[PDB]
């Protein structure tokens, strides 16, 4: 079944600032507002649709598989933003990257506390 994940909603205090944060960090573009959402289209057919939140925002986890050249570019923008990054999902190792599955990866936070991850090889792969 040619099923695709088409979108998920990302709760945000400032949906426009939060969508721009993700779009800028990943080298993508923000879409025009659609209803109450600010969508960010990810190239594999799914959009992260930012919605103004009320009350506490439960942190979600969004992990992006990126090319090695994109890893270097994204990593540059993270450092330029003065953001702490971590090798590990539990944030024990700030200022380091992991090398899972022969790739490279790191975790960081968006303005709402969502846990963003970049990785260059799929979990459990290596070739």
Residue of the chain from 63, 65, 78, 83 that contacts Fe ion (CB under 5 A): 63
Cite the annotated binding site by residue number.
7, 61, 117, 123
What's the burial of 84, exposed, middle or buried (CB within 10 Å: 0-12/13-18/19+)? exposed
Residue 76 binds: one of a copy of itself, Fe ion, none (C-beta under 5 to 8 A by kind)? none
Please report how close the Cβ of residue 111 comes to a copy of itself at its closest, in angstroms: 18
Give the chain's length. Answer: 127
Cα–Cα distance list, 69 to 80, 81, 96 (Å): 17, 19, 18
Binding site for a copy of itself (CB under 8 A): 1-9, 26-28, 34, 42-46, 48, 58, 60-67, 70, 73, 119, 122-124
């Amino acid at each position: 079944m040619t099923v695709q994940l088409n979108h998920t909603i990302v709760a945000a205090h400032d949906k426009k600032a939060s969508a721009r944060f993700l779009a800028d960090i990943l080298g993508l573009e923000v879409s025009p507002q659609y209803g109450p959402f600010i969508p960010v289209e990810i190239p594999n057919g799914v959009s992260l649709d930012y919605l103004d939140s009320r009350g506490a925002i439960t942190p979600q986890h969004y992990a992006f598989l990126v090319s090695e050249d994109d890893f270097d570019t994204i990593f540059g923008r993270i450092r330029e933003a003065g953001l702490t990054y971590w090798a590990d999902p539990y944030h024990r190792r700030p200022g380091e990257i992991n090398h899972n599955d022969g790739g490279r990866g790191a975790y960081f936070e968006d303005p709402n506390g969502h846990n963003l991850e970049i990785l260059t090889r799929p979990y459990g792969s290596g070739g």
